[PDB]
Design a binder for this molecule. Structure first.
Ligand SMILES: OC[C@H]1O[C@@H](O[C@@H]2[C@@H](O)[C@H](O)O[C@H](CO)[C@H]2O)[C@H](O)[C@@H](O)[C@@H]1O
Ligand SMILES: OC[C@H]1O[C@@H](O[C@@H]2[C@@H](O)[C@H](O)O[C@H](CO)[C@H]2O)[C@H](O)[C@@H](O)[C@@H]1O
Ligand SMILES: OC[C@H]1O[C@@H](O)[C@H](O)[C@@H](O)[C@@H]1O
Ligand SMILES: OC[C@H]1O[C@@H](O)[C@H](O)[C@@H](O)[C@@H]1O
Length: 362
């Protein structure tokens, strides 16, 4: 009885009414730039899944301005090539989705330039593989930058003309990730890798399990399945998603609600506020891939029910409607960080995460 399409549109309208900067073609310049990339993904994915085009003009504006050489990383020469590889990876994946929505080769070309830029910081000398996140420093190979890269090459393996070298890169990247140790004993992914002071060998740094690091990897494996038709990639994704859904692992509350590890102590920073929606969108991708790979009508039904359950809780306990004024008649919905906890304030990363959950149920 809940209309996820209308709620996503209200959530996007709330996102624009409070956080979109027309003069900058960006959401919230006081927030991390990469989260504007995530927001762009959610808006593109809303249009892709709902069949609507109401934000297409706005998305094109954002792309055209955020394409330009970044003032804080001119040496990237624009096209979203930034001072960290994960920043680049978020926009690169948004361009994959833009290409999926529009069929405009221009966006596919951006993702291709991004893949080649990110790969510059893949090294086999440390950790036997993987890329660094901090381009200027080269001190950290983490989960998210390698999950983004892996989903990027796996996506390009299904879309780019030289799809073979991208499929080989994806298969090689997944083999490295699987062997990295970052996937722990309960099939959840810790934050990144530490390096042995004496031996130089790398190991799971046991930093927190963040929801978005259980998400991007699902989309990556889904694209690897589409590229190979090997259901082993789906089964591996399902083991990771199942671990998230199991309340015994602390990511899913006793009410069945996705919960970031920082929500308990009310310490979720500007980055962590956006994590849950990224997982939700990728989980919906996994659900679609699972239901299409088997003739069982109940295939992937647990993931849909999970997303549905999480939507209603967010719908009921985390929502606050904007009240219009005599000057601003904007209507929409605002959302806080906890999908079960109360609504206290809204921020752009919280709102972006909100849209992702609604879009995940379209
Ligand atoms: O990355 C998001 C934000 O980055 C800001 O640039 C930062 C530089 O000012 C600083 O010198 O180094 C960090 C390293 O990441 C840069 O991110 C932008 O000014 C912001 O607009 C952006 O939201
Ligand atoms: O929130 C967890 C994530 O934190 C990331 O480190 C941040 C950098 O990306 C950012 O640019 O600078 C701040 C400095 O406080 C860092 O918190 C990790 O790179 C991620 O792996 C981690 O999930
Ligand atoms: O694996 C631990 C890593 O933690 C990160 O937060 C730091 O930025 C890296 O320098 C460090 O190597
Ligand atoms: O992709 C997942 C979505 O697929 C749609 O076909 C269903 O109607 C939604 O309920 C579900 O959340």
């Amino acid at each position: 009885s809940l209309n996820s399409t209308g709620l996503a549109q209200a959530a996007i309208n709330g996102l624009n009414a409070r956080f979109y900067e027309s003069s900058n073609a960006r959401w919230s310049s006081d927030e991390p730039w990469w989260i504007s990339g995530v927001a762009l993904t959610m808006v593109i994915e809303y249009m892709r899944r709902s069949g609507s085009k109401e934000y297409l003009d706005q998305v094109e504006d954002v792309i055209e301005v955020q394409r330009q050489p970044l003032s804080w990383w001119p040496s990237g020469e624009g096209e979203f090539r930034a001072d960290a590889t994960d920043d680049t990876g978020w926009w690169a994946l948004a361009m994959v989705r833009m290409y999926d929505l529009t069929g405009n080769e221009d966006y596919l070309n951006i993702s291709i330039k991004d893949e080649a830029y990110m790969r510059q910081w893949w090294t086999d000398t440390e950790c036997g593989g993987g890329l660094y996140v901090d381009i200027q420093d080269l001190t950290y190979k983490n989960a998210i930058a390698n999950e983004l890269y892996l989903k990027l090459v796996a996506s390009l393996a299904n879309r780019a003309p030289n799809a073979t070298i991208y499929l080989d890169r994806a298969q090689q990247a997944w083999t490295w990730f699987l062997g990295s140790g970052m996937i722990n004993g309960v099939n959840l992914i810790n934050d990144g890798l530490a390096r042995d002071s004496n031996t130089g060998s790398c190991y799971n740094n046991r930093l927190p399990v963040w929801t978005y690091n259980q998400g991007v990897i699902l989309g990556a494996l889904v694209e690897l399945y589409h590229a190979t038709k090997d259901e082993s990639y789906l089964l591996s994704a399902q083991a990771i998603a199942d671990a998230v859904l199991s309340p015994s692992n602390g990511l899913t509350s006793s009410s069945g609600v996705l919960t970031e590890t920082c929500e308990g102590s009310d310490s979720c920073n500007q980055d962590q506020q956006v994590f849950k929606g990224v997982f939700a969108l990728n989980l919906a991708e996994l659900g679609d891939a699972v239901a299409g790979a088997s003739s069982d009508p109940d295939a992937g039904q647990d993931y849909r029910e999970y997303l549905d359950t999480n939507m209603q809780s967010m719908y009921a306990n985390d929502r606050s409607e904007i009240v219009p004024t005599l000057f601003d008649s904007s209507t929409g919905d605002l959302y806080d960080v906890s999908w079960s906890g109360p609504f206290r304030n809204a921020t752009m990363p919280k709102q972006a995460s909100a849209i992702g959950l609604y879009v995940a149920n379209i």
